[PDB]
């Protein structure tokens, strides 16, 4: 179901928005999760250009420079 | 008829005669508090009862008791009006006589000393105005009546959703007025469970054991007996024929040498009748039949002395043969059936963990207070203190009553604590319900719904005060010495003070009266709420209780209820509705005996009304009042259908008795859908008063009763002639028939003048009478705001045309001509109260001095030497109303400003400008200025000026009163002297003061002379006090907050006409917003060249179904017609004949309408005035469901020489050419909501921010930025505007560097952003990292 | 919590007076230019002495 | 931080931290004092409790703040925030350069612009105004510029008219649902405090003029300006992102106008005659010599773009009406004349725009739409359409139908009286026949309302569609529907008690007639039920949308 499918998101910062904050923060903390952004919500939270639209170019060039020469 | 009804008359359509006229609308509010505060001889609710509850209070065993004698309410500190200015609370001192007795130890009880302390003041309590309002701080407030579930027993069902099985359930709940709730509930296994409050579940019988009931006794309570006899050998059984019902024979049923029933043959009514008439008292049964039967009491062997079987245990062929050899003959077994009489209690016992009273008390104490070690004294004290404590528990009267009534008892009144029989009976009833006999009541039913009011709640609060102080009394009496203290040192002030002050101060029920409007106030004071303490919440209750119940008939208004977060949780009181003696709701009805419908009224409550057959207000009866039709529409038990000619016991009292005072003001309501009707009756209370109060052109007839019953107008206390008429005051000379023998007297009504309301509107009374005019007892002497000659005018009628005008009227938006803004008719006056605070900081005191650093002479001009604005000085936004300055040391500048100040020689002031400026954009005239100085701080210049001015004005105002009153009195004396003493010319010659020294012949006239003088001197001395006090209250420094040295309150009167963006609607729930203001030039006109005032949109009418908004337009048209005709005849000055004729014609209108009109009226001096007031139009009354009809309106139209179609050809003011097809034109009453754009419009560029999270926040009433929500973000997401979003949530809001670094680039002409990180996320970083969580930003 | 029962808790209403409003820092940024431009017109040692 | 009245205010974290610190120290001391075990244990326990209350309160005994009953807000609550689930970046944030007010009409507007209140625009662009002001040199320094606009010197109005030109502004309404809930427009300076919003866009916003208010935002950075103008720009969204159909479609007044034009009657002025172009077909009407609706053969030049990338041209004597002919003057280029030859209802008037978009492109469609709005309002005004009480016609056969069905109920009543039918069987029968009656009266009223106008051309009688106002409104799609009209003229429905069971005594009266006490009371339940239902389904819709945006 959509409500269940929304539960799975790689970004924990995103999860801290809609899900139960406490749990998510802990559960991610123990595993030493690394939130790389790459999504909308997680980016809106940190106040960075949306990885879509006018900013999809920015996030693209950045993603490409990243993990490369 | 009446007097002020001569100045005008509303034409009343409709047939049904009023059988009962409308009572006082403010009834509830006044009556309640009238009961709360009063001296009541008995324990009936009031401060008396509240006292008698907790009192007397004795020390713990200490034999020092404090009892209560009597209480009194001293005269208020300030009157209603003064207190409204100063800003204190209008309240009376509570003086109560208390008695402290010290019993000599070693009884007989007698006291060494009882010190009876004089009345000890505990707190002051708020008082209720004649208008049913309270004043907390200089503000009229209302306490909304509360509606909640009445105390008693309640049997619910809760089927369906529970357990998914479908076996349903049955629950009972005993809810007291105060204390813990007692719940009994079943479960799928039919085990009876009990819980206190919402607490842990427990098997029911465990309560009974705490009441000292052994298993044997419980079984004796809930089960009958089946007697077994071992006579001879091989058991027999006693038999009652009704027992065998609902069962098939388990064996051969035979006795008396005759076999009545065989095996496998069910026992029907046949076998039962046979066995019944044959009289079979005994039958022999097999030894195997008792294999399932449960033994009743215990059993033991006389010999062995051991327990054979415990009570409530299944017998077997074994145990039977064990107790039968022991000699036992009789064995008692429960009478059990899984259909008729259920064995629930027996199975309840099997789940019962406990055994005796002690064990039960323990398991209970470990329930209520789980985890702490249980003790005997503990488990005892708890259980006794729950339902049996006179202190901690009560159902009150309503509770005991509903309790016994729902238990089918006799006594309607009894104790407030449960009895063993009470609880046990309730259990029995729940059981009976599960067994199939008896029904289940419902919460929504108004019979289970009670209604409190101000008085009850106020009493509850004062009660909590009394208990929290009781603890103190018992505390101090612990260690106390003998005569050293008195009932003063114990009882404090604050416990009562803050307790009652809290309620009136902050409660969801207590609130600022909504005063923009008479109907607003009066519909606020009649209001009910299921919210607040004791009630449910918006999120708590679902739609059920919100929905209109059939019981809401004649009690609650089905239409007028708020639409929003809470719907149906409020509603409103019906017109004729009354609070029942017990506090249910009861409604007027007409008793129908035999075949005649009698005019005798009757008051039936929700429960009372139930079985009776009630006819309808809309029904036809003629002459003696027999129902015409043999079949009449009637509602009887919950439902409504056609009933036989005479089957009826009752009929509706009025046509309007279903609705509310607000809903009754909607003309042609029968033609409006309930949705838009709700919207209308909701918006009608939002009507702002006008500058020229006009009149409804289209009425109902409630418009009088509303404005009159409300305090907005000023009614005459007595009939007579007016000695004096001023816009300030009105002086009536009292008629002799009314006026009391002593003191003579003339009624002097001081009128309220321009002053601030709670809504920041204007409230100003105006005299409706002329100099020396005859008045009637209870007549309107002076109108209020939005009131015309006793009738309620919430707005102004005007010429309306339905037609699309070049899209300017596109949506519900309204297009109005310039004729309206020119005539200033829709103009409204606003009064804003602004305040200036002179505080004290460690840096120094603040000054109100006119000496302000950095200000122009234009700014300094408008203020006096003291720095306060002149009364009458017109100001705009930015002007300085009050000067203020606060000390700030060490300016601490930078080299640029160091050089700057060095060159231009400007000493940087040690003070910053704190002055109270006029709010930006608003402009008005200063009417009034107040100065509140701290007691002990020297009064400034302006302060003294104001003080002395008030002193002289008060001297004149009181002296004038003394003069008028005295002249009036002396006149009465002079009147008495001429009877029995007569010298007319010879009397008034000598000095007036000498008249007192005169006598008269022996008679009662010599006594009245004594009276007139006896009272004279009273008024003579009553001057002194009334002066002295009045003087002192001007001088004394009003108490203030910590740190504030003084306060300057300025009152501004702004005048706003109307402009595009304002919201205005009709009474039919058709909203609108003025779009453009069109020149009279461009306004569509008719063949007569008369321009139309307003052009609406005909498209809004069909979809939103209110067809009434059209009828009001049609009738109104015709109505205005009848005005114009008269206006012609008056302009042509025909004669008193033609006018009388036409007027008589208009007041009749075809056939069959109750009217009762003129030819009694004086041929000239009266009629000619009526017509004079009627030239503006002919006011028409259209009762709610009794209102006018098509043909009647059309006929009136014919009388106005207007078309039947209500449509007249119109012409564009532009091209002048005709509009194809006609257009409906007429007159519609249009209000103006207080939603004016001048308030609504807001904007900001860069304002002040918030300290915690850096975010835009309005400090100066410079409105903080608009909120950008998650959805509003999703929009930008969908569009894919990335930078718009970034800047939206970063640089424009949350970024502390971003904002300024932006602003700089903005002025530099460079549009860019250097975003950085929002402070919200940064704060979150710190907050997370504050915990044991390490959250870092990585990479690059 | 203040009225409305919402998360409108009193602390969210405490405004920051401590931080300078942007409209100020604008003017200061400009006053730099004013004093500099005006100190450009004085003689060498007059500029040096006034700055010093 | 301080506060007025000398009083202070502080976070609850201070109370908590204070407790933890104090107890910790007490433990250190008790260690140095060699206290007995029971004491050091009790202390350690207490410290654990305190530290817990600090980190997250409520997994423990729920400590309360000093002299206040309300439980102190812990750090966990500082993070979690409240009002459902958001932390400060979702539920909302306050934003600079913004405003709001009540909205008004402004039919003179072009779809790409909106009226912006003068004072509002002053306060909004205040930073830009400063910049331009001292850019040209009208102001010495920034301070002086502030004093200038504070005084509102006459020059600043023109200075503002400079910054307003190409700088778009964002407009938004309260229930933002779909991206069209926020659009970009071009500011047009207007007197008064009200915002003027283009009527065609009133559809997407779902904004009635009943006092709804609209928020405004300023696109600060350059990128925000270009973003607004090339994306959020109103003129760039004419199509609902949900479906290809136009969202700019004329709403009510305008469609009534075009309806009243494109309509045709039987016999009127100029009926039968012939005229060359629509240019003189307008002259004939304006002069009053020819009626707006009459059948007249007239020549027209219609274009078709059928040639590859190229517009063809032709002409013919078409059978049309004066009104349709005049309306054709607006229709640009490639659109065939066959599009305006119909009755032009709210449906067809939309497909006109759609075809215009899929054929001529964006710009022609936009200007087309502006024109359609203007002419719509104009001719709708000229039409003098109104609503009277007699405009709603009740069937003459109504009372008869009522009486016959009323005979049915008594028939079934006699049946049940004799036990011929069971209670439920009877109930179903009665409700069936009553509903049947309702259908009869409805399908009657619609007929007596629809074609009942009977007129004459050169003969005695020829009957056509009705010119009745409320009917024109319902037929065009301007407002109202057969279902609602049914409630106006014919009897309205049957009502069901709160239980949900339908009552067998329907409402035999309509709105034009009086509804007595009963009928109204019985209607009330359905009313409050309706209001509650929609008001709640709003929230449900919102929740659904939220789950959806979260999953995607
Ligand atoms: Mg709306």
Could you explain how this protein is built, in words?
This is part of a larger assembly, with two copies of chain A, one copy of chain B (1340 residues) and one copy of chain C (52 residues). By secondary structure, chain A is mostly helical. Chain A has helices spanning 2-5, 12-18, 21-31, 40-46, 56-65. The longest helix of chain A is centred in the middle third of the chain and has 11 residues, at 21-31. Chain A is globular and about 35 Å long. Chain B is of the alpha+beta class and 1340 residues long. In chain B, the strands form 22 sheets. In chain B, strands 58-47-60-46-64-62 form a six-stranded mixed sheet. Chain B has nine domains: 24-150 and 443-573, no CATH class; 151-223 and 342-442, Dna-directed Rna Polymerase Ii 140kd Polypeptide, Chain: B, domain 3 (Alpha-Beta Complex); 224-341, no CATH class; 574-654, Roll (Rna Polymerase Beta Subunit, Chain: C, domain 4), CATH 2.30.150; 655-711 and 787-826 and 1057-1240, DNA-directed RNA polymerase, subunit 2, domain 6 (Dna-directed Rna Polymerase Ii 140kd Polypeptide, Chain: B, Domain 6, Beta Barrel); 712-786, Beta Barrel (OB fold (Dihydrolipoamide Acetyltransferase, E2P)); 827-937 and 1038-1056, RNA polymerase II, Rpb2 subunit, wall domain (OB fold (Dihydrolipoamide Acetyltransferase, E2P), Beta Barrel), CATH 2.40.50; 938-1037, Helix Hairpins (Helix non-globular); and more. In chain B, 28% of the residues lie in helices and 20% in strands. Helices cover 54% and strands 4% of the residues of chain C. Chain C has 52 residues and is mainly α. Chain C is rod-shaped. Chains B and D meet through helix 17, strand 58, helix 24, helix 25 and helix 29 of B and helix 3, strand 1, strand 2, helix 4 and helix 5 of D. The structure holds magnesium ion (MG). Residues 208, 210 of chain D line the site of magnesium ion. Chain C: This is RNA polymerase sigma factor RpoD. Chain C: It is found in: Cytoplasm. Chain C: Belongs to the sigma-70 factor family. RpoD/SigA subfamily. Chain C: It comes from Escherichia coli (strain K12). It is classed as transferase.
């Amino acid at each position: 179901g959509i409500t269940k499918a929304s539960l799975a998101t790689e970004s924990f910062i995103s999860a801290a928005s809609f899900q139960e904050t406490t749990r998510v923060l802990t559960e991610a903390a123990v595993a030493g999760k690394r939130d790389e952004l790459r999504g909308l919500k997680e980016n809106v939270i940190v106040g960075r250009l949306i990885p879509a639209g006018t900013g999809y170019a920015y996030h693209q060039d950045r993603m490409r420079r990243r993990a490369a020469g | 008829y009446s007097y002020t009804e001569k100045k005008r008359i509303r034409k009343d359509f409709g047939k049904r005669p009023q059988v009962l006229d409308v009572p006082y609308l403010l009834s509830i509010q006044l009556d309640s508090f009238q009961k709360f505060i009063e001296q009541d001889p008995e324990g009936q609710y009031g401060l008396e009862a509240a006292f008698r509850s907790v009192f007397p209070i004795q020390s713990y065993s200490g034999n020092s008791e404090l009892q209560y004698v009597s209480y009194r309410l001293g005269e208020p500190v300030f009157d209603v009006q003064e207190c409204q200015i100063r800003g204190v609370t209008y309240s009376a001192p509570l003086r109560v006589k208390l008695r402290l007795v010290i019993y000599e130890r070693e009884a007989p009880e007698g006291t060494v000393k009882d010190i009876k302390e004089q009345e000890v003041y505990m707190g002051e309590i708020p008082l209720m105005t004649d208008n049913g309002t309270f004043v907390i701080n200089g503000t009229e407030r209302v306490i909304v009546s509360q509606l909640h579930r009445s105390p008693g027993v309640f049997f619910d069902s809760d089927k369906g959703k529970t357990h998914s099985s479908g076996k349903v359930l049955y629950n009972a709940r005993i809810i007291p007025y105060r204390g813990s709730w007692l719940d009994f509930e079943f479960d799928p296994k039919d085990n009876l469970f009990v819980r206190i409050d919402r607490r842990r579940k427990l098997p029911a019988t465990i309560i009974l054991r705490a009441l000292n009931y052994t298993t044997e006794q419980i079984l004796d309570l809930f089960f009958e007996k089946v007697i077994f006899e071992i006579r001879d050998n091989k058991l027999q059984m006693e038999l009652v024929p009704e027992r065998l019902r609902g069962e098939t024979a388990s064996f051969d049923i035979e006795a008396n040498g005759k076999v009545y029933v065989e095996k496998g043959r069910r026992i029907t009514a046949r076998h039962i009748r046979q066995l019944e008439k044959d009289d079979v008292k005994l039958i022999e049964v097999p030894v195997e039949y008792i294999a399932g039967k449960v033994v009743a009491k215990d059993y033991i062997d006389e010999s062995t002395g051991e327990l054979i079987c415990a009570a409530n245990m299944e017998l077997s062929l074994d145990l039977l043969a064990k107790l039968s050899q022991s000699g036992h003959k009789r064995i008692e077994t429960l009478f059990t059936n899984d259909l008729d009489h259920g064995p629930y209690i027996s199975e309840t016992l099997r789940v019962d963990p406990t055994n005796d009273r002690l064990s039960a008390l323990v398991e209970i104490y470990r329930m209520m207070r789980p985890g702490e070690p249980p003790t005997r004294e503990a488990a005892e004290s708890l259980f006794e203190n729950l339902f049996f404590s006179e202190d901690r528990y009560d159902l009150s009267a309503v509770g005991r009553m509903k309790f016994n009534r729902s238990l089918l008892r006799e006594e309607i009144e009894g104790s407030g604590i449960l009895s063993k029989d009470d609880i046990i009976d309730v259990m029995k009833k729940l059981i009976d319900i599960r067994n199939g006999k008896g029904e289940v009541d419902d919460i929504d039913h108004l019979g289970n719904r009670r209604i409190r009011s101000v008085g009850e709640m106020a009493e509850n609060q004062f009660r909590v005060g009394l208990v929290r102080v009781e603890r103190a009394v018992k505390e101090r009496l612990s260690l106390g010495d003998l005569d050293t203290l008195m009932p003063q040192d114990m009882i404090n002030a604050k416990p009562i003070s803050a307790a009652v002050k809290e309620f009136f101060g902050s409660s969801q029920l207590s609130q600022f009266m909504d005063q923009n409007n008479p109907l607003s106030e009066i519909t606020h004071k009649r209001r009910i709420s299921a919210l607040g303490p004791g009630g449910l919440t918006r999120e708590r209750a679902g739609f059920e209780v919100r929905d209109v119940h059939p019981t809401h008939y004649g009690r609650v208004c089905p239409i007028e209820t708020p639409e929003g977060p809470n719907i149906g949780l409020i509603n409103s009181l019906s017109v004729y509705a009354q609070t029942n003696e017990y506090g249910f709701l009861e409604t007027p009805y007409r008793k129908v005996t035999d075949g005649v419908v009698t005019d005798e009224i009757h008051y039936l409550s929700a429960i009372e009304e139930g079985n009776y057959v009630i006819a309808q207000a809309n029904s036809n009866l003629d002459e003696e009042g027999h129902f015409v039709e043999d079949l009449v529409t009637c509602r009887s038990k919950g439902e409504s259908s056609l009933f036989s000619r005479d089957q009826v016991d009752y009929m509706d009292v009025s046509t309007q008795q279903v609705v509310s005072v607000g809903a009754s003001l909607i003309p042609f309501l029968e033609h409006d859908d309930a949705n838009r009707a709700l919207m209308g009756a909701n918006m009608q209370r939002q009507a702002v008063p006008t500058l020229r109060a006009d009149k409804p052109l289209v009425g109902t007839g409630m418009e009088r009763a509303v404005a009159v019953d409300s305090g907005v107008t000023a009614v005459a206390k007595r009939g007579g002639v007016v000695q004096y008429v001023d816009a300030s005051r009105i002086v009536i000379k009292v008629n002799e028939d009314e006026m009391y023998p002593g003191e003579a007297g003339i009624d002097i009504y001081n009128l309220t003048k321009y002053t601030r309301s709670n809504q920041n509107t204007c409230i100003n009374q105006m005299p409706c009478v002329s100099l020396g005019e005859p008045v009637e007892r209870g007549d309107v002497l002076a109108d209020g705001p939005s009131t015309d000659l006793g009738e309620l005018a919430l707005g102004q009628n005007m010429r309306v045309a339905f037609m699309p005008w070049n899209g300017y009227n596109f949506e519900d938006s309204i297009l109005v001509s310039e004729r309206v803004v020119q005539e200033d008719r829709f103009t409204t006056i606003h009064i804003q109260e602004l305040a200036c605070v002179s505080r004290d900081t460690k840096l120094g005191p603040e000054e109100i001095t006119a000496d302000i650093p950095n200000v122009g002479e234009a700014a300094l001009s408008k203020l006096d030497e003291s720095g306060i604005v002149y009364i009458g000085a017109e100001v705009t936004g930015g002007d300085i109303l009050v000067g203020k300055v606060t000390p700030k040391g060490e300016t601490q500048l930078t080299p640029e400003e160091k050089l700057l100040r060095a060159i231009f020689g400007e000493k940087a002031s040690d003070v910053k400008d704190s002055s109270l400026r006029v709010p930006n954009g608003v402009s008005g005239t200063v009417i009034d200025v107040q100065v509140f100085t701290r007691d002990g701080v020297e009064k400034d210049k302006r302060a003294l000026e104001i003080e002395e001015m008030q002193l002289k004005q008060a001297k004149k105002d009181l002296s004038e009163e003394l003069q008028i009153l005295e002249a009036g009195l002396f006149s009465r004396i002079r009147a008495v002297l001429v009877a029995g003493g007569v010298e007319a010319e010879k009397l008034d010659k000598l000095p007036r003061d000498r008249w007192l020294e005169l006598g008269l012949t022996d008679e009662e006239k010599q006594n009245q002379l004594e009276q007139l003088a006896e009272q004279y001197d009273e008024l003579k001395h009553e001057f002194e006090k009334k002066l002295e006090a009045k003087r002192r209250k001007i001088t004394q420094g009003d108490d203030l907050a910590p740190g504030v040295l003084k306060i300057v309150k300025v009152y501004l009167a702004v005048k706003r006409r109307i402009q595009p963006g304002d919201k205005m609607a009709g009474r039919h729930g058709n909203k609108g917003v003025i779009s453009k203001i069109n020149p009279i030039e461009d306004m569509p006109y008719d063949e007569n060249g008369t321009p139309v005032d307003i052009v609406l949109n005909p498209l809004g009418v069909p979809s939103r179904m209110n067809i009434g908004q059209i009828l009001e337009t049609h009738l109104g048209m015709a109505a205005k017609g009848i005005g114009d005709k008269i206006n012609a005849m008056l302009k042509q000055q025909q004669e008193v004949a033609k006018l009388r004729e036409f007027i008589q014609r208009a007041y009749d209108l075809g056939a069959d309408v109750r009217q009762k009109v003129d030819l009694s009226t004086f041929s000239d001096e009266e009629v000619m005035r009526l017509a004079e007031n009627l030239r503006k139009g002919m006011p028409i009354a259209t009762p709610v469901f009794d209102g006018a009809k098509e043909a009647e309106i059309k006929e009136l139209l014919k009388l106005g020489d207007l078309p039947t179609s209500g449509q007249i050809r119109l012409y564009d003011g532009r091209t002048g050419e005709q509009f194809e097809r006609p257009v409906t034109v007429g007159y519609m009453y249009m209000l103006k909501l207080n939603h004016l754009v001048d308030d609504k419009m807001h904007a900001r560029s860069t304002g002040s921010y918030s300290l915690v999270t850096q975010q835009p926040l309005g400090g100066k009433a410079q409105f903080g930025g608009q909120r950008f929500g998650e959805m509003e973000v999703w929009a930008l997401e969908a569009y894919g505007a990335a930078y718009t979003l970034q800047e939206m949530l970063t640089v424009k809001s949350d970024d502390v560097n971003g904002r300024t670094k932006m602003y700089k680039n903005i002025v530099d002409g460079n549009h860019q952003m250097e975003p950085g990180m929002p402070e919200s996320f940064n704060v979150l970083l710190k907050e997370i990292r504050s915990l044991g969580i390490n959250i870092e930003l990585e990479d690059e | 919590p203040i009225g409305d029962d919402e998360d409108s808790h009193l602390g969210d209403f405490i405004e920051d007076t401590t931080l300078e409003l942007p409209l100020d820092s604008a003017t200061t940024e400009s006053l730099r230019a004013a004093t500099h431009d005006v100190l450009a017109g004085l003689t060498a040692r007059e500029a040096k002495v006034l700055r010093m | 931080v301080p506060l007025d009245g000398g009083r202070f205010a502080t976070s609850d974290l201070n109370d908590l931290y204070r407790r933890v610190i104090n107890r910790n120290n007490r433990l250190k001391r008790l260690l140095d004092l060699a206290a007995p075990d029971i004491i050091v244990r009790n202390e350690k326990r207490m410290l654990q409790e305190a530290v817990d209350a600090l980190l997250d309160n409520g997994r423990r005994g729920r400590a309360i703040t000093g002299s206040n009953k309300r439980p102190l807000k812990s750090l966990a609550d500082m993070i979690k925030g409240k009002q459902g689930r958001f932390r400060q970046n979702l539920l909302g944030k306050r934003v600079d350069y913004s405003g709001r007010s009540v909205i008004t009409v402004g039919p003179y507007l072009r779809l790409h612009q909106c009226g912006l209140p003068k004072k509002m625009a002053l306060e909004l662009f205040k930073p830009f105004i400063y910049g331009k002001l001292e850019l040209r040199g009208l102001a010495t320094t920034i301070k002086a510029a502030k004093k200038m606009v504070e005084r509102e010197e006459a020059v600043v109005w023109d200075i503002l008219d400079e910054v307003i030109r190409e700088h778009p502004v964002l407009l938004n309404r309260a229930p933002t649902l779909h991206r069209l809930g926020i659009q970009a427009f071009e500011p047009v300076l207007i007197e008064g405090k009200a915002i003027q919003l283009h009527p065609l866009v009133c559809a997407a916003y779902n904004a009635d003029f009943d006092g709804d208010q609209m928020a405004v935002h300023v696109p600060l950075t350059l990128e925000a300006q270009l973003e607004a103008r090339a994306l959020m720009m109103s003129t760039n969204n004419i199509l609902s992102p949900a479906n290809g159909e136009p969202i700019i479609v004329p709403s009510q007044d305008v469609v009534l106008g075009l309806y009243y034009m494109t309509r045709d009657c039987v016999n009127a002025k100029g009926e039968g005659m012939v005229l060359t172009g629509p240019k003189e077909a307008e002259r004939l009407y304006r002069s009053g010599l020819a009626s707006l609706h009459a059948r007249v053969k007239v020549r027209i030049t219609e274009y078709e773009k059928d040639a590859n990338g190229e517009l063809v041209a032709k002409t013919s004597l078409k059978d049309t009406t004066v009104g349709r002919a005049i309306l054709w003057m607006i229709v640009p280029k490639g659109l065939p004349y066959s599009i305006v030859n119909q009755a032009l209802g709210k449906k067809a008037i939309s497909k006109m725009l759609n075809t215009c978009y899929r054929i001529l492109g964006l710009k022609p469609t936009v200007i087309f739409a502006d024109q359609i709005m203007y002419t719509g309002f104009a001719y709708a005004a000229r039409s003098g359409a109104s609503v009277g009480i007699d405009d709603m016609v009740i069937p003459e056969k109504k009372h008869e139908i009522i009486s016959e069905a009323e005979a049915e109920v008594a028939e079934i009543q006699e049946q049940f009286q004799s036990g011929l039918v069971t209670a439920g069987e009877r109930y179903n029968k009665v409700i069936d026949i009553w509903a049947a009656a309702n259908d009869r009266v409805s399908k009657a009223m619609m007929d007596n309302l629809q074609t009942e106008t009977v007129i004459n051309r050169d003969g005695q009688e020829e009957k056509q569609v009705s010119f009745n106002s409320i009917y024109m409104m319902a037929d065009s799609g301007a407002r109202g529907s057969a279902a609602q009209i049914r409630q106006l003229a014919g009897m309205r429905g049957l009502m069901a008690k709160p239980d949900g069971s339908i009552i067998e005594t329907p409402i035999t009266a309509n709105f034009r007639e009086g509804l007595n006490v009963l009928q109204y009371f019985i209607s009330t339940h359905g009313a409050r039920k309706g209001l509650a239902d929609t008001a709640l389904k709003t929230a449900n819709s919102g929740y659904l949308t939220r789950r959806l945006v979260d999953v995607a």
